[PDB]
Amino acid sequence: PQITLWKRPLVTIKIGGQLKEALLDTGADDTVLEEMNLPGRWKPKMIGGIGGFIKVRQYDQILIEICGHKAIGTVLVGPTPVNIIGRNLLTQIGCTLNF
Amino acid sequence: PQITLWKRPLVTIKIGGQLKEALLDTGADDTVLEEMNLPGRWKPKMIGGIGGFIKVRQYDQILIEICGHKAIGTVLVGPTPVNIIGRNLLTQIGCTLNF
Amino acid sequence: XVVXAX
Ligand SMILES: O=C(O)CCc1c[nH]c2ccccc12
Secondary structure, X not given: OEEOOOOOOEEEXXXXXXXXXXXXXXXXXXXXXXXXXXXXXXEEEEEEOOOXXXXXXEEEEEEEEEOOXXXXXXXXXXXXXOOEEOXXXXXXXXXXXXX | OEEOOOOOOEEEXXXXXXXXXXXXXXXXXXXXXXXXXXXXXXXXXEEOOOOOOEEEEEEEEXXXXXXXXXXXXXXXXXXXXXXXXXXXXXXXXXXXXXX | XXXXXX
């Protein structure tokens, strides 16, 4: 797709039989979700943003489908106000910024 | 141009006659820049993100050049760790996500 | 409004 930015670039994602939605986020190094369904044990990670720094839960090798495109990579679970797909996964689906 | 996302999408901008660099962020509703002086009257605004809220000064109808592309709109100024161009100005340069 | 992650 070619997605304009007049609204939030929210897309359908699927992880483990669960349909969610997340924001295609070029300003995020990482993919951060508020919750994942029963994802098991995780690694502690610190990330930062405009307001400060937060503790997140790192899960590696997650099978995720983004707007129909299959990707494998790291998903963080953390107190993000919106579910975000970061560059770690955006590159995997061949996503670019164009103007 | 076409910008891949293997690294942060930082680009050259020009604002208040000064060359700066800023992160093209599809996950930012608004444009937030580091401390600088801008013309006109500002209003107090708060913006959210990862790590909490920050206090910014809102300047309206500001001219910004993003990779030589002219855009007029709202620029927030405050204690951001990185200059961020949000959707409010990305739309003004016809920036799209493509995959 | 949010402005998303270092
Ligand atoms: O005094 C200043 O320099 C700006 C104060 C300021 C900006 N955004 C704000 C939001 C709420 C309260 C105060 C502010």
